Each structure stands twice: as C-alpha cells, then as structure tokens.
C-alpha cells in the first residue's frame, strides 16, 4: 500500500569526537518494494552536490520489505563547523522525490563542567554505594561519559540522557555503583567525558575517599 | 479511521489524598459524519457504568477528539486493578479495546540522599545541590526542592532511569546563588512515592562544619 519513507541520521557523538573513528551521515529508505527496489541518492554539502557517498548492501527486512541505505563520510571538522548535509531520494513508488537535511545542532558550544560527588554518609549502611558525576553547562547535547578504575571501565554505571537546563545548556548525571568495600579501601575512580568544547575534546575527574 | 489511547492517572493524583485519580480513554480522528462514540468500561473484567464523557472538542485540524474519563479509587489503582475501555464508532470495522493498570512489579522504597556542591564549583556564581533518589519501583514519583517551606525556583529533575537491579533512579539538581549556600541556609528535597511511609519523605542539605 504505502510507498517508501526516508530518515536521515547524524553521526554518532563518539564518531565526531574521536580521532580513531570516521563519522558519517546515513540516509535510510524504508518500505522499498520488490517491484521497484532501485533508489537514486543525491547528496549535497551546503547546497553543493557531492559524489563520494556509498550505498550499503540492500537488506530484506523480516517483514519482507527492502531497506536501502546510502552513507556519506563527513570530515570531523566539517561536521563540527556546522555544514549542512542534504539527501535527495527518488524511487518509482514515490510521486515526487523526498529531501531531508541534517546538521549539528545550531548554537554556540559551551564547555561541560565536570564534578565528582562522593556517596552520602547515609548510604554507607548499604552493600553498595553511589559515586556521582555531575556534568553540566554543556552545549550541544552530544556527549560521551564513562566511569573507569585502574584504567578499566567499570561494570555498573548508568548515565542519564542530557536534560535541558534553565540557561539553555544541558546537564546530566552518571551514577557509578561499587561495592562499599571498594570505596572504603580508598580506590580511585575516574569519570571521563568527551565533548566538542573540551580541550582536546576530553576531560577526566577522579574521586576517592 | 479513529485511534484510541488509554491513559493512566497522573502520579501525584494517585499519591495525594487531596487529588482524584482517573483513567482517560481518548479517541482521536473522529469524523464529522459519525461523531458518535460508544464507550464501555470494565474493572477486572466487570462492566461499570460510572464513567463520564468529557466535552467534545474540535481540534485545529478539524477532527473531533472524544474522551471518556473513569474515576478510580486510590487504593484500587495501587492494588493493581485493571481498567479496560472498549470503543465503538461507525468508522471502525471492529471495536477497539485497551487495558491499563499500575505497572506490574513489587514496589520498592526510594532511598533519598542529598549531596552538597563540589568544592570545585565554588568559583561559580551559583552552586548545585543534588538529590539522588534510587532503588524505587514503580517509576511513578514526584520530587520537589524547598527552603523555608517555599518551593525553589530553579531545579530540574531527571526522568526515572532503569537501573541494573530493575529499580529506578533519578537525580534532582537544585541551583542556588553561592551566597545562600555559604550562609548556611537549609534546603530540603521532598519525594512522594507509594512505597514511602505515608507516601512521602524529606531530606535536608546545608553547609554546617
Ligand atoms: C518493516 O520493518 C522495518 C524494520 O523494522 C520497519 O522500519 C522502520 O520503520 C519506522 C517507521 O515506520 C522507522 O521509525 C523511525 O525511526 C527513527 C529512528 O528512531 C525515528 O527518528 C523516526 O521518527 C521513526 O520512528 C524505523 O527507523 C525503521 N526501522 C529500520 C531498521 O529501518 C518498517 O517500518 C516495516 N514496514 C512495515 C510495512 O511494517
Ligand atoms: C489532529 O490533531 C490532533 C490533536 O492535535 C491529533 O491528535 C494526536 O494524534 C496522535 C496520534 O495520531 C496522538 O499521539 C499519541 O500520543 C500518546 C501520548 O503522547 C502516545 O502514547 C501515542 O503512542 C501517540 O504518540 C496524540 O495523543 C494526539 N493528540 C491529542 C491532543 O489528542 C491528531 O493526530 C490529528 N489528526 C490528523 C488526521 O491530523
């Protein structure tokens, strides 16, 4: 019955911030038919057509439709400087082509402030205690947070999604749970944050009794 | 054709004596040709007849929204009774049925901890007071920061997040002028939840060497 639908995805945050990763924008076409699987993708960067996108392997979904996907590698600095990426999709089951445009969220970046907070004394009655990392004042909301100890990632932590604050920046908390004895024995735990507005896109704060 | 949504009561409505909780059966995209909607309601399988239909509302897109509300007893909802709405309309080939109840699972009492601002935050104009609320089930909860009985103007509370033990946690961040912390004013984090004694608890935070 219904024709295809198009969704355009930004790079993953870590891909935009890590030297070792390659960020890409992903143009996804769903509900493509078996009678007309062919999809034309045209790509534009700030309105200028580009030709280095690549089509991923066509994929039949469990519901017997085709998913057709084009990916365009982006330069780290291009994405972070706010370039606009446009995908134009044509298919014979569409009456007209579909255009979508994506870019990094607009707004002046702001550096996260990272504060480690020890467990409350009242939590010391429990088997495990909570080590809290408050990350606030950041913009845009794309960010990565990890808790580590002795250079290894901790097994049991959860990070809230960024939440808009009253000044137009974002904040989050990351809660690390550890056995009480590991806190009491004086081990050092570290909260690591990646964000475009940090120096070298990275900072780390440590916490210990 | 029309679509049917069934909403539970507001969390505060379920926990406050002074409030009346209700379940709301919402029918959208009702036509002008056949605005008539029949509602049947059932409580644990047993038809009831004390629901009320809200005033019909034409929406900005020129469709009708038709809503039936059924009042629920505080104890009935917390004891997990199940509420079914059956909807009939000429533009439906078959009636639509929807059931809703308190989320299944044994309740667990929130643990509430207040965490003072980091010393590293003391060069800022304003400091962050943190309320960690963890280990609670189900996720329905309300949180508020106060001082001298009056609610605070500038706090934000994260949505509940599922933790690794199947309970929820959240943080509530209160922002105050540094001078109000430095001068020893007392702030309080108040939490309402079904598994608290009297459905309420309060924890204070202040600078007090
Ligand atoms: C057949 O199966 C595929 C795979 O499950 C379905 O594809 C999915 O289609 C929905 C839209 O109908 C897409 O939802 C979109 O997701 C994005 C990302 O969260 C969101 O931004 C959009 O607002 C929207 O929710 C979903 O991405 C897509 N999943 C995949 C893997 O491509 C397809 O709809 C099914 N077709 C039929 C007729 O059932
Ligand atoms: C015409 O305007 C009305 C009112 O703006 C639109 O009603 C909305 O319809 C959508 C689904 O079509 C409803 O979304 C649902 O919301 C619930 C709770 O947020 C969610 O659980 C569901 O999965 C879904 O997202 C939405 O509740 C409803 N809004 C209101 C005020 O009733 C309607 O869609 C428009 N109809 C047409 C033909 O344009």
From Swiss-Prot, chain B:
This is Immunoglobulin heavy constant gamma 3. Changing residue 76 to N: In variant WIS. Residues 2-101, 110-206 form the Ig-like domain. The chain holds residues 167 to 375 of 446 of the full protein. Changing residue 58 to Q: In variant WIS. Glycans are attached at residues 61, 156. The gene is IGHG3. It comes from the Eukaryota. It comes from Homo sapiens. Changing residue 148 to N: In variant OMM. Immunoglobulins are composed of two identical heavy chains and two identical light chains; disulfide-linked. Residues 1-104 are annotated as: CH2. Residues 105-209 are annotated as: CH3. Constant region of immunoglobulin heavy chains. Immunoglobulins, also known as antibodies, are membrane-bound or secreted glycoproteins produced by B lymphocytes. In the recognition phase of humoral immunity, the membrane-bound immunoglobulins serve as receptors which, upon binding of a specific antigen, trigger the clonal expansion and differentiation of B lymphocytes into immunoglobulins-secreting plasma cells. Secreted immunoglobulins mediate the effector phase of humoral immunity, which results in the elimination of bound antigens. The lineage of its organism: Eukaryota, Metazoa, Chordata, Craniata, Vertebrata. Among them the most dominant glycans are HexNAc5Hex4, HexNAc5Hex5, and HexNAc5Hex5Sia1. N-linked glycans at Asn-61 are diantennary core fucosylated structures without bisecting GlcNAc (HexNAc4Hex4Fuc1, HexNAc4Hex5Fuc1, and HexNAc4Hex5Fuc1Sia1). Glycosylation on Asn-61 is required for interaction with Fc receptors and ability to activate the complement pathway. Disulfide bonds join 25-85, 131-189.
